Nucleic acid binder design. Sequence first.
DNA 1: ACATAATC
DNA 2: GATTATG
DNA 3: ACATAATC
DNA 4: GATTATG
Lengths: 60, 60
Amino acid sequence: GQRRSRTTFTAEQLEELERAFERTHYPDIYTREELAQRAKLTEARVQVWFSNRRARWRKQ
Amino acid sequence: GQRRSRTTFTAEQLEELERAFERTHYPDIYTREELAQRAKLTEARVQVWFSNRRARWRKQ
DNA sequence: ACATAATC
DNA sequence: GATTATG
DNA sequence: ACATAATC
DNA sequence: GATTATG
């Protein structure tokens, strides 16, 4: 029942991610893949980040 | 708003997957990773497959 | 503890 | 995305 | 069309 | 996992 360990993002990765979010809250597959590449993340990690970021935004 | 294209599984991959499901409907991260490796899939694709397989099982 | 990553 | 669970 | 992969 | 959407 073990789950994946919480990922820690580098300041640098967060930059790229926050940069993308500023442009769009719902990046398409193309955008998520290129961002994953740039950030040295998996597309899965990127998708999860965006879901969680949207949550934070609305929580405001 | 483009989404990832539907993945097609080889008969061989399905074998491994169905084999795993038979053992457990909720494989842990360890199991999903090793299965991804064996099957030449991403762990993301494996996780999604298991969710969808559970749905089929209950639909019965 | 809680902010937020992972699950489903 | 609502819920669960952890670095 | 629908079975089932992807989204969120 | 409920919902959305496609090979």
